[PDB]
Design a protein around this ligand. Structure first.
Ligand code: LF2
Ligand code: LF2
Ligand code: ARS
Ligand code: ARS
Ligand code: ARS
Ligand code: ARS
Lengths: 148, 148
């Protein structure tokens, strides 16, 4: 479906903590991290990290206020990210599933942050089996083809 | 050169802090993070995170003691990682370069951790221009081909 440089980024809450989830919209691949607080600095830093790893051209969010601080706009400026406008908003979600996966592994770990990376791993390696690729395989296929 | 599932993982120090650098040996692509201390818990957690994102089968290090705690061995156990034995050790380095890149951007950021992600970004997007791919492009080409 979508252009290969579009990501969605949102926060969810669990155990009084904050989880920042990035989804590569064309593949369903996710990167996620437990942040100590839902702040502009945390998002800017996560954006730098994400952009260093994948070719990130536009990012969408379901809370536009998330991207208004100069701190975040400076990270996008530096990394060359645009904020996406082609996905409008209805008053996905691969955020519910990652909440279901976390509950399922929650007791395998003391910290939520560990349970989260467990769930990311399971999500990205899960064979979405129809011709049955995982999201980890799909992102790589999509970005590689878009190069070659 | 190398199998597409081999990574090298090491720590370096800067500004009294610790930087954990993972290199995808076949492509030169790096992921790096500033950790508060050089501990088994930090490495296990980083391993979970790395394995959720790329198909990681073996990891090498230049300090074998790094991987001896049960904490780390449990992360590899869970993620299905083997510790690599096919790269022997002479009594790379893409660790020096990332130290050169950091110095070059150091004043663009208050925190070292920010400067580090800046340097990762520059390193991975740098056109190694001979037929002139970047490490970010090469990793994706290598893993995709190894699927298809
Ligand atoms: C705090 C912790 N302590 C441990 C102590 C001994 C052992 Br054996 C494993 C862990 C693990 C542990 C748990 C699961 C896996 Cl797969 C690997 C290590 C954790 C996990 O935290 C990290 C990964 C940050 C170290 C956790 O959240 O429970
Ligand atoms: C602490 C900090 N405060 C800021 C305050 C205002 C503005 Br405008 C930018 C920053 C940036 C800043 C610097 C560079 C870029 Cl590219 C984006 C934001 C940082 C950087 O830290 C992060 C990314 C964690 C917020 C830094 O280390 O200096
Ligand atoms: As958020
Ligand atoms: As932006
Ligand atoms: As280390
Ligand atoms: As291991």
């Amino acid at each position: 479906d979508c252009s290969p440089g579009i990501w969605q980024l949102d926060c969810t809450h669990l155990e009084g903590k904050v989880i920042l989830v990035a989804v590569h919209v064309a593949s369903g691949y996710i990167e996620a991290e437990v942040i100590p607080a839902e702040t502009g600095q945390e998002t800017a830093y996560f954006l730098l990290k994400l952009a260093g790893r994948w070719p990130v051209k536009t990012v969408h969010t379901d809370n536009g206020s998330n991207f208004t601080s100069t701190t975040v706009k400076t990270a996008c400026w530096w990394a060359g990210i645009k904020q996406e406008f082609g996905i409008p908003y209805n008053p996905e979600s691969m955020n519910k599933e990652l909440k279901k996966i976390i509950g399922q592994v929650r007791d395998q770990a003391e910290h939520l942050k560990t349970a989260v990376q467990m769930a990311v791993f399971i999500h990205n390696k899960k064979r979405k089996g129809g011709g049955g690729y995982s999201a980890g395989e799909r992102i790589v296929d999509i970005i590689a083809t878009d190069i070659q």
